[PDB]
Design a binder for this molecule. Structure first.
Ligand code: HEM
Ligand code: HEM
Ligand code: HEM
Ligand code: HEM
Lengths: 141, 146, 141, 146
């Protein structure tokens, strides 16, 4: 579960992301396609070229779903309801894959938040990405 | 894969009694009931909304027998899992877009099925030799991914 | 989430384990150390040889724990509060090992319940063990 | 491991700028904070009660530099990590009883660290190259488990 401090810590790092979310989000996805190339099996109908509009848009959608979760940290299931349904019933993405993106996102924040990515901010972020992943996977079966 | 004389003997002996038709089918069906998300690759297969439905569907049975039959040839070429499955590895990657994690999930349900089928005869040591086989097949398959 | 049918399937199945629960516990540990050798890393103080009374008695404790899990299917976090503090703050077993025992445990049930190890029954049990694993690993961080 | 010439040069060049001891201590320190169950091996290092305690601990730091120097000598032998890490692998299994998952944990914490240290120089392709190196090492360290 997320402790009080965890929430303060996400809300702080994320605030800092500010307007770049969409950009960060696109960077994460490309980090993932390069690192874990099996994750591409889920995007066969995307142009996964670098700078592709497809990747940049989806990047922005991802980041928006994250800001929202950040906004409704005390109520994620609710806040992501529509999203867990989609991933569960439509995309049917194997739960392993959520670890992979979370990792890639964490690397993305690291590279862009020198001053803020303290060991404790890092732990709280790792946890929140775990919870986001658990909420999104919860209706799979 | 590397298996002790003991392990090959146990793998192969159990395999001689497996009905590739019945087992392939059970294995595939149970994949789709246990981890429903895998149903995304078989959109064009029939009603898959019920365990009865899954388990009773001719297309699933059909597929199962083909998977197992493929698996069977790996067994026979335990020394060269990679070279044996390279073509099907490329198939599943470039044409099918199957996340190789599914190989794993299948490898596990197969163990479960042999166990259910064989009971006592499927001993800890026998399980172990099969756990290795399936892991090997799942890696020979994920091998051409890119 | 455990549906009323999953609950029914679990009670049902576990009920046929009955008195063999401990016996099945041990066999599960056993399949576990031989299948996934890395898990032995946590019992360097046990005689892991076959027939080992330490395995046997450990098998029995796990089993009894699952029994108590079944009995309290609606309030598992409470019923397993002590086990979760233990695994998390003392043993500190990597979460990834909970999956490996859960599998060996499904495997043992299968091999002993040839009639009740129906595909449906197979899914409610795996659901059940993944929740039990979730509970035990909920206080890690 | 399996690295194109370009990937090797990439790995080799950033590495040239790492302060081994500093990063070593950071990664290890970060491991103990992010994934606290890893602390189980380090009870004789003393206070690990807070993130500050962990990061400030001379024992963690000293342990970090030893782990990172070995990793570092590893790079010289990308061609044969299994060769290079065989004894150590034997040690973590037989005498330390370190679950090879921890290695996978460190590998990823390490990547996080490189990313935080180098920022923008840590591009998506630099990350990929590193991700192969770290999975290769963790594999090589787990090969003699039994
Ligand atoms: C925290 C993790 C994730 C979040 C917040 C997230 C969020 C989203 C959102 C908001 C959408 C689109 C909804 C709309 O169109 O507005 C979506 C779609 C999608 N996601 Fe996820 N997602 C996550 C993880 C994953 C992972 C791990 C994968 C697979 C590797 C995945 C694959 C997909 C695919 C293929 C689509 C549809 C793309 C298209 O065809 O438009 N997602 N996700
Ligand atoms: C694990 C070992 C597996 C083996 C050896 C294997 C082998 C095969 C074979 C031999 C074919 C058909 C080509 C022919 O008709 O000769 C095939 C097709 C296929 N496989 Fe795999 N398979 C495996 C697992 C999987 C898994 C886990 C999935 C995803 C659940 C999958 C998805 C598919 C699909 C969708 C097709 C084509 C179905 C169609 O065209 O109707 N396979 N596989
Ligand atoms: C549902 C899964 C599990 C259940 C129900 C369970 C239950 C138990 C119980 C009841 C105890 C003894 C506590 C006491 O005597 O107060 C125990 C201890 C222990 N467990 Fe677990 N456990 C689970 C999973 C794990 C896993 C996956 C591992 C590692 C591979 C693990 C490693 C240990 C160890 C090392 C101990 C202490 C053994 C000793 O030194 O006496 N457990 N567990
Ligand atoms: C690439 C990953 C790693 C490498 C290269 C590595 C390398 C080393 C080396 C070189 C030593 C000392 C060898 C000797 O005294 O002969 C060692 C000791 C040790 N390592 Fe590892 N290590 C790795 C990961 C880890 C992890 C992740 C853990 C636990 C979370 C760990 C736990 C230990 C412990 C407890 C010792 C003994 C410390 C002592 O007795 O002073 N190692 N490691």
């Amino acid at each position: 579960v997320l402790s009080p401090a965890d929430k303060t810590n996400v809300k702080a790092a994320w605030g800092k992301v500010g307007a770049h979310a969409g950009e960060y989000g696109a960077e994460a996805l490309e980090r993932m396609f390069l690192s874990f190339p099996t994750t591409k099996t889920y995007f066969p109908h995307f142009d996964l070229s670098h700078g592709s509009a497809q990747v940049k848009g989806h990047g922005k959608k991802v980041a928006d779903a994250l800001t929202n979760a950040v906004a409704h940290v005390d109520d994620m299931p609710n806040a992501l309801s529509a999203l867990s349904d989609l991933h569960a019933h439509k995309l049917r993405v194997d739960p392993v894959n959520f670890k992979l993106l979370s990792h890639c996102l964490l690397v993305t924040l690291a590279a862009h938040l020198p001053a803020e990515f303290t060991p404790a901010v890092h732990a709280s972020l790792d946890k929140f990405l775990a919870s986001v992943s658990t909420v999104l996977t919860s209706k799979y079966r | 894969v590397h298996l002790t004389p003991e392990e090959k003997s146990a793998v192969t002996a159990l395999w001689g009694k497996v009905n590739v038709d019945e087992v392939g089918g059970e294995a595939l069906g149970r994949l789709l009931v246990v981890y429903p998300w895998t149903q995304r690759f078989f959109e064009s297969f029939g009603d898959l909304s019920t365990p009865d439905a899954v388990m009773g569907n001719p297309k699933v049975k059909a597929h199962g027998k083909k998977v197992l039959g493929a698996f069977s040839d790996g067994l026979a070429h335990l020394d060269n899992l990679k070279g044996t499955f390279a073509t099907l590895s490329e198939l599943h990657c470039d044409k099918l877009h199957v996340d190789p994690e599914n190989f794993r999930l299948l490898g596990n349900v197969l163990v479960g099925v042999l166990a259910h089928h064989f009971g006592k005869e499927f001993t800890p040591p026998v399980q172990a030799a099969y756990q290795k086989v399936v892991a090997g097949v799942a890696n020979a398959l994920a091998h051409k991914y890119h």
